Each structure stands twice: as C-alpha cells, then as structure tokens.
Design a protein around this ligand. Structure first.
Ligand SMILES: C[C@H](CS)C(=O)N1CCC[C@H]1C(=O)O
Ligand code: NA
Ligand SMILES: [Zn+2]
Ligand SMILES: [Zn+2]
Ligand SMILES: [Zn+2]
Length: 231
C-alpha cells in the first residue's frame, strides 16, 4: 500500500503513516525522461513536527507543507537535511520562508554551498566522525561514515523502531548503482555495517528512494555497491 512513483504526479506529495507519530513523505521528479520517487520522514514531537528532508524541490516542498497542514495539522518547527543533494535541501528556502528552522551538519552545509544548492540555516554539532550519534528531538541522528555521499546521515526513531537510511540505503528493487558521483564506494560497505551495528533492532527501514522494507535493505545495498565496485 506504499505509494509508488506511478501514482504521484510531479508537483504532488503523499504521506504514508509508518507507525504512530511517524510518516514518510513521497514526492516525484522527472530525470532524463524517467520519473523517480523520493522519500523523507515526518516525526511527531509533542504538539509539533520534525521534518526530515525536503520533498525534492521548491514546488514539491510547498505541496508537502500544504499536505502536512491538511492531513496532520501540527506545525513543522524544524527540518533536518540528511545530505547536500537537491532531494534533501531543494526546498530549504521554502521551508525557511514558512518559519521552519532548517538544520544540517557543517559538512552538508559546506558541500551544498560548493554545489550552489540551498543551504540549511543551522549547523548540527557532534556528527563529524564515523559512528557519531546525537539526539535531536524525537530522533537520533547518526553519521555512519561516507557512503552515498561524504556527509550522509541516517535517522532513527526509537519510539517506533524506524530507521531512515536516506540515499545511503537502496530499495530492494534497485539492482544497480544509482548516482554515485559523490559517493565513497570504498567506505560505503563499512558505513553500512556501522548502521547495522548501531540499529540492530530496527523494524522498518526507509530508503531515500522507493519502498520501505526491513534490515535486509542494508545487505542489499552492500551487494549492489560491491558489484558496482567490481565493474
Ligand atoms: C537528485 C538525486 C540525489 S540522490 C539523484 O541524484 N537522482 C535522482 C534521480 C536520478 C539521480 C540523478 O539525478 O542522477
Ligand atoms: Na544510538
Ligand atoms: Zn544524493
Ligand atoms: Zn533559527
Ligand atoms: Zn537521493
């Protein structure tokens, strides 16, 4: 029942309740003539919401805010971007204009600036070394090491046993490597192993693109990465 890329027109956003107080958000964009989905997360924080990642662009992110207001009706007070690419920070200016406090690691902020992307306002401390974790409202943020990008973070919701892998974790249906231009292929498997080690109790694992599953998505990603490595 997870919404698929064929059931969301570009410009629209769907929410999917994963567990009590936890949703993913799903949006789409076209790339090179194909249509791709992208996921983020929404976590209830008392009477407010924590947003993880934009909906991939300004128009989608405006739609996200409208959909959250319509369906949930609680204010989004903070947002965290999990890496510097446009499916994570594209829409930050929209969030900021709407009064949402935007956050990312200093590593993400630097890379976004170099790329000419939107730059979250606030810097997250305590995430500079592989294996570092910090609590952020109702979630834990974890830097597993370089993988899909050098800055990628994962997010865990301990109340719900939900692990949001972002773009460091691939869905099962992805059989070959995606965008690896900014990746550290050599470190990626090691970084995945850190995630497995730190969150062995995860019940739901959400990739940055595509269908959720369980912890098997980690080994799946390792397999695809290692196949690409040996191309
Ligand atoms: C914008 C995302 C960031 S992980 C991306 O790179 N995509 C998403 C669609 C394909 C691929 C690309 O642009 O090469
Ligand atoms: Na932890
Ligand atoms: Zn990316
Ligand atoms: Zn602020
Ligand atoms: Zn992505």
């Amino acid at each position: 029942e997870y919404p698929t890329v064929s059931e969301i027109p570009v410009g629209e956003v769907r929410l999917y309740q994963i567990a009590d107080g936890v949703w993913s958000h799903i949006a789409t964009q076209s790339f090179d003539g194909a249509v791709y989905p992208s996921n983020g997360l929404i976590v209830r924080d008392g009477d407010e919401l924590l947003l993880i990642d934009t909906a991939w662009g300004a128009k989608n992110t405006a739609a996200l805010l409208a959909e959250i207001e319509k369906q949930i009706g609680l204010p989004v007070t903070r947002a965290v971007s999990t890496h510097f690419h446009d499916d994570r920070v594209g829409g930050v200016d929209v969030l900021r204009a709407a009064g949402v406090a935007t956050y990312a690691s200093p590593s993400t902020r630097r890379l976004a600036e170099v790329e000419g992307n939107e730059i979250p306002t606030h810097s997250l401390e305590g995430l500079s070394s592989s294996g570092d974790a910090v609590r952020f409202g109702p979630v834990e943020l974890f830097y597993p090491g370089a993988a899909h990008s050098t800055d990628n973070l994962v997010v865990y919701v301990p109340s719900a046993s939900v692990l949001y892998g972002g773009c460091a974790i691939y869905e099962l249906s992805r059989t070959s490597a995606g965008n690896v231009a900014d990746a550290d292929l050599a470190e990626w498997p090691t970084s995945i192993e850190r995630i497995q080690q730190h969150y062995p109790e995860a019940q739901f694992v959400i990739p940055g693109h595509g269908l959720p599953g369980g912890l098997d998505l980690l080994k799946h990603t390792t397999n695809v990465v290692k196949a690409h490595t040996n191309r």
